[PDB]
Amino acid sequence: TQQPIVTGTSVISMKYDNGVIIAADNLGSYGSLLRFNGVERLIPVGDNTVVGISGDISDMQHIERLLKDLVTENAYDNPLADAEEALEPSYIFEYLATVMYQRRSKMNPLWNAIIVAGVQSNGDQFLRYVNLLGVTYSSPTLATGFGAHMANPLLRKVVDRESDIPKTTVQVAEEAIVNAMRVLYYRDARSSRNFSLAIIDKNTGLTFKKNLQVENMKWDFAKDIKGYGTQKI
Amino acid sequence: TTTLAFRFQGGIIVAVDSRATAGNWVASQTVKKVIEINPFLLGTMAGGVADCQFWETWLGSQCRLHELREKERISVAAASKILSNLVYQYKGAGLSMGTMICGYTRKEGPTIYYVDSDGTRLKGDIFCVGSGQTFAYGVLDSNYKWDLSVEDALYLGKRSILAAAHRDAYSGGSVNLYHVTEDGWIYHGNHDVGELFWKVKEEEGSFNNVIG
Amino acid sequence: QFNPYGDNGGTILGIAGEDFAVLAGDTRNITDYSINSRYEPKVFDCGDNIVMSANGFAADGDALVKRFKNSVKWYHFDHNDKKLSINSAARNIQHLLYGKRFFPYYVHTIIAGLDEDGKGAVYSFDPVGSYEREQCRAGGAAASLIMPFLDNQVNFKNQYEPGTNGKVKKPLKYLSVEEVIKLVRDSFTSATERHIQVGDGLEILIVTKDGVRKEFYELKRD
Amino acid sequence: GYDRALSIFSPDGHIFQVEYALEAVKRGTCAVGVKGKNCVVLGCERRSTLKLQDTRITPSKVSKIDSHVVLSFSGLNADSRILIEKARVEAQSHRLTLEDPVTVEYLTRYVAGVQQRYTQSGGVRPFGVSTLIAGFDPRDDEPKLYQTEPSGIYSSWSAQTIGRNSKTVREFLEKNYDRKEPPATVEECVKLTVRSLLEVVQTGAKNIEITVVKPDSDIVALSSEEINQYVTQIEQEKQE
Amino acid sequence: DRGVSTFSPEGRLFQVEYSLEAIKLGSTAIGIATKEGVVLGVEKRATSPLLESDSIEKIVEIDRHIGCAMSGLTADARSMIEHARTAAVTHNLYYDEDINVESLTQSVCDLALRFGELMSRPFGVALLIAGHDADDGYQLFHAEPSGTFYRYNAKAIGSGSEGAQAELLNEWHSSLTLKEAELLVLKILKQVMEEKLDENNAQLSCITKQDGFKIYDNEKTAELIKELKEKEAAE
Amino acid sequence: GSRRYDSRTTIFSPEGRLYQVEYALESISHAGTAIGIMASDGIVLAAERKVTSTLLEQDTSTEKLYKLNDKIAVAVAGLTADAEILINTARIHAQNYLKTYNEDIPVEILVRRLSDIKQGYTQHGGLRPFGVSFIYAGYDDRYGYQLYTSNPSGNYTGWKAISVGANTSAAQTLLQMDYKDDMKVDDAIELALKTLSKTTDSSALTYDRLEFATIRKGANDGEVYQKIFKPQEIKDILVKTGIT
Amino acid sequence: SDPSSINGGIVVAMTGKDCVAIACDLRLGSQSLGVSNKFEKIFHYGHVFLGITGLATDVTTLNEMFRYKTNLYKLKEERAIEPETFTQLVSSSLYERRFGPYFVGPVVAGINSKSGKPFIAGFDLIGCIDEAKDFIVSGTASDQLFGMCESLYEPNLEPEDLFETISQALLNAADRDALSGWGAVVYIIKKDEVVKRYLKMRQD
Amino acid sequence: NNYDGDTVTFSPTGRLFQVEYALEAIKQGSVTVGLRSNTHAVLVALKRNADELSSYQKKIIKCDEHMGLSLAGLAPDARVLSNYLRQQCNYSSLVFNRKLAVERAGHLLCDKAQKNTQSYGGRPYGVGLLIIGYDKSGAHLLEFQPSGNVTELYGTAIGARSQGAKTYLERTLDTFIKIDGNPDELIKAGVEAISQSLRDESLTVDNLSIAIVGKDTPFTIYDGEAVAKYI
Amino acid sequence: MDIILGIRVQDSVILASSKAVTRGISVLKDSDDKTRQLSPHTLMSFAGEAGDTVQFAEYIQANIQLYSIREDYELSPQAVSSFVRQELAKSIRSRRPYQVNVLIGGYDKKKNKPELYQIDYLGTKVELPYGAHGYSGFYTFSLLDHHYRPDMTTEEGLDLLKLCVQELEKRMPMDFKGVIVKIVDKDGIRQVDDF
């Protein structure tokens, strides 16, 4: 049993016709203090998987090392390490899920919420969640922390069920994700303007975008708001 | 829960209710609270549903192993002490059990042992165990004799459970009867309390407080 | 302080027919007042014509199902590909659950299938491994809503024959698979209306001598 | 720990360490067991090479395992103490858990099991001891007499002997013991036991020990004078 | 000296091959399997007439549906029987059913090669394990200290084994009745035994679906011995 | 591997003897003779130190006679270092018994415990046995004055009079000749010394070559005293008995 | 609840001219219930005397433990243990149970047999040594004993005078404590004679 | 000679005699064949009986839905090694949701056997194994030796008289590798291959033991009247 | 359980122990014997937490019986009491201590004296002319302080014991369903069947 110290906030994600998109901001909070402003919380594994992590950052860095080691281990005595016997999204997830549930079972959890996004060998979209309790679930859209409350409602208007996935393009999907990140910046007190985004497509592969910023923000209306009720000046 | 067992001329009568509850919610009315350990041994269940089931079926495995090794039926004393010594090892861990181990051997005759999760092991003639044990005791103590017929003894057990089923909120469903002789136990049916209450009320003239 | 348990909601329902058995469950998965997934399968074909669901804390549910599936596999290896009977499966699951008596799997387990006489069978468990064969059992969040309805409409409880006035009971005539599916669908429609953790979709697994079939029905998504 | 396999098979299918343990038994002082109709008697040889002995305090050859069972032996004395101690502990353990004293067959089976275990465990040698276990089961009047040996095999005997010159006294018993009609009384049973030892012992003075066990935990050891009277009567009948 | 788990130049484990020689010195045990049941019989071989022969226990119950006969260093068999009984009962506890005869035998044979420098040497005893289950019916297995087990229609082990096996080769067919099998075991035991066969120095047993595993009384066997004598004198 | 160098200390010979026990007894037969004689009013322990020197400090020396508690003492024959290991174990066992039952340990129970330890080294562990034989002289309120002996096999026996170490065959014959049951301590003192004086391999028996001890009820009223004799006291008792 | 005051009791020790004195009450109780009036708290191992207050089961256990150790000491050393040396042994033995201690308040008293010098010493429940020239106190009425000793005591008191001083110190201190009393014993100790006196006191 | 007392001792020429003696136990064992095409992989095994009353000893063991092996030598050692494979296949599935690669299964068997050849007290395994399987890189056939050496092959045979079947496969290499989408013809080629190792005895209904695994074919074993088709 | 008493007179020790067993609300039994014979001339009564009492008593019984067989000799009451004390003193610092209080009544055949030892669950031993555990002493000790004289007969002891039980039956709230009385003397242990 511990308490989380340096923490990361929401991770958000969704499926689209030819793949999956995932995003998370670059902040490492220390309670209410916005301590570290250059923290990468999306961690790619090969050219077919991206693991998004929220919660305790020391535990995140531990998980990051486990994944790095997993790649090294898979390559051992494996001539098809960059082909048929490469690491799949499903393999990487199931491994993490196993660890998370084992650690909770020893009453010493990795204090995180994790989303594994990727594309499988047969082109199938992979998107699944796991957290400190070892709880897992999949959905056309997945989000952690505040994202669960604010992002999912917006992303579910694009892809409400399974049949909406082929009808959703990558342009429409990215647009929805970027908007969700703006909304989280308006409303989450432990978020930052700077974020990273990752697309994994079955055709065009893994596109990793860094140093993105929330833009097109509405603040002008604030000038007209005066007092808390009766005040006119 | 109301479970009883008593020694008499014709052997042992065992009677139990069928109700299982989680708070105020009635989880099951069809619970088998008598465990058939072998053709000669019965165990009653009260307290933790799982603890009792698990460790009393386990007891049957230890009894089978005894008679495979010793070429002889296990004594009620030995069988009961295997269970009590086991639960004593777990004392403090939070097991919840109140059980009667009932049997009939040549050397002992009809024998009943009260075994309990605090480590208590008691030999006796009459025992009532469970939330509705006080209600069942009332009927038993006033009507019990050594010289009861198998028919009258069976009814007294049935009636004592009915008494507790009525008053105790955590007892009810149905009544399972067993009669234990030296050649083994004999099952005497499932009796729904919904039908048994009205039947007994009419025939016995009892429960004049209730309208029917 | 760290709490190793959680509640993922959901509800499940097993009914045993004369020569068949169904095990249904809603597809919604939740924490607190949020939906995690509208379609997260909860009932599983475990092989040997046995279907299983472990409702409650999903992480413990998935662990248990995973370990039972594993037990079926090793049963085949160790006993010359012998079919694991439903009664044998039930006893094995008791030991899986009781093995963690002092740090329990936080689930309500139900399995369904056919017994060795071909007749429909449903078994029900508590979190620490006690079990009992039943004709009818609902489990999980809305179990208190569904069970009474099933006492009335499956076992004809408190029902009697017209003209006799409480003297003659309604006879316990057998229910077809079509008739049971009707009762399952209505049970979940009703449960969805009045329970916030039930909804999105209903998935039913039917078990017969021919094998394991699946049916899916939409439920209200609010 | 010392794990060396001392008891192992040989090309001809023999375990020599177990067989050499039997040779240690052959060296030991003679012990004999005879069961009558309502009693069992255990006779034992005391070698008279050791005088200036204190017979009050010297370890007696027959040992009580419980109030109703006794154990005598032939072979290494020091080894026998270890088996006796274990047997005494198991006897009290049985009473504690089963709420009933051990049967003679059970106690034998336990002692025999210990001996067997020492024939296929690493770092240990077999016991150089064969035992005669005798007594009466609880609430039973049928006499019991069992034998064990280093290999761990055990069996029941109407009458049996072990130790040095046991071949001779077994020869005596085989012609003198009738199964259809065993020694009906205590006197007859003791007499036959003393007779069998007199085939081997030397002097009938302080060289013979006799212990009589009867039903319901009735065990007594005969004194020098009491045994000496049996020795006197046997030879006076023999002078004819 | 040399390792306990050492291979010979021919590719055989020295200790296993030497334990087989100990089994050849043991008393004879015979088993015959039929569609009506499986019969098990043994030579008691008392070393002296003062030894009460009924205390010689070479046929043993493992469960209601599984019996067992032994030959060789019979003291070694006690921990094997204890394991077998535990395995049979434990499986019933875990699965609420009888355990397959083959699965029981496999569990016993798993102990065999657990020796080294675990126990210090292999078992010096062979076992005939007979039983019935719903899947494969009436069965007879031969469990060696090598860890190997063969199923048999009929099988003899011990000192008079190769002579008995040759006799079982000619006599066994698929339509044998239980009565015919009882007499056949007695006939072959009588042939290979040193002393004259009677109810006190030989023991019979069987396993049927209905009645389970039973050791035959000395009175019951005595009648079957008398029935055998008469039918041999009949031609 | 290591098997190659293993002597296998705990095995039977083809004749059914324990090699190492037999050889340990051969070692003990060269050790200085120790004698124990039990009387009605006490027990005597006499023992010969092995070929000493004039430059050995005798008054502070102890190789033969050791005190286990206030009621029990032992005479040693064999490896002194091995004996001290066992002696310290015996001293502890006595104190464990006293703590548990609040009574002084009965002599036989102490003797059985030490003898069981010796036995263990002959059956398991692969170690060499202890090359020691003890004479136990002790008193308790059950059996009174008692003499025991134990040897490397772990076998023990009770005695009226007994010798261990060198020339036991000759010593035991002499003791068997002159010992009587109604004997007293003063007489037993004389017998012990006379027996050593005849069996000794030395030219003459002197005070500097002996260790002597008595266990008497010759203590003021119903109680027992242990006396470990000083050099000058051994010299005086040698003159008194007429040996020097 | 507090282990050191379940049973009750006191011990006091003092020095004089070529002599030492140690005294104790005789009460053993179960909180308010008086159980025994013959529970002596002073023990001796040779010429070294040890008083022990506190939880009664530990008083008994430690006595048996130090008898054990002093008996082995004597066998190996071939001499009786001296007060100074015994004091160190008590300290060592208590501190080894640092985090699961015996709930006791031991007091040592005796005269060194070689130097002739009087010696007393006290300990807390975990081994700390207090080696006073004048006096040592212990038990449930230790505050009371401190007050009596500090006023009544003077140095170089003759054996018979010292008896009076230590007795009055104990008696009057015990009478102001509910869990002490029910009889008392005083030991006067000279180089080669030790007198033991039981005191007549109020039995409430 | 002086260097064959235990496995921890090299000979003066650098040989490990205990390992070589374990290799000899395989040669005494009954013949078993393994071959594969691009779609399927087959095992054919001649089972051996004790006598006419006895059953024929089983040669083939299933390890997973996609992997299994045939044995030759000490059967209990095959049970130990197959049990280890079963666990490793199972660990890969439960932890990584991944079917264990046949090549990696060979690497694990190699390393397990090796530890028994370098330590005092233990002994080498006395059995040879032929592992077939279908994974993400198609059909596979492996040959395991208890020295630790594992080899991937198109076809092979081990046991007594295995040289005859091994030569036949060496001739037929170009033909049977092309047998794609035709399980019956691939088994025919395996049955005809094992026939080159028979003397005196022929393939009967309770003698023969066949196993197959492929693209849309789980690892199954055929015995009894199920192989009468191929006799 | 509840009330256990003991009194040592001229030539014997008398133990009295209640018959009731109560689990919570109900009295399950009214004929329970809260004692075990350790040896022919030594008897131990006990009271404490459920289960622990019998488990501890039988465990001590087994150990003493083992000693008797091994040495063919009966331990003195003093020796047995010291053994029991040590077991409890060991127990009190265990993971889960024995919650048991005992009285040990024996007759020493060597000294020809009766002996009564009171030991609590902490391992606190005292030899006494009369003793009790729990709240029993609170009512009975004042009577025993007045009437006891060390030279009483066994009959005078039983009368003084009846006066103690009568006081308990008057002033104690709990119904302990009477007592089973046992006497320990030179001839061994016997039960007074009418009390």
Ligand SMILES: *[B]([O])([O])[C]([C][C]([C])[C])[N]C(=O)[C]([C]C1=[C][C]=[C][C]=[C]1)[N]C(=O)C1=[C]N=[C][C]=N1
């Ligand atoms: B009975 O009420 O004691 C009954 C006996 C049991 C063997 C069926 N126990 C229960 O009903 C208990 C609750 C309880 C009620 C009253 C007294 C004591 C205990 N129920 C359970 O243990 C339980 C466990 N899981 C699900 C439902 N019920």
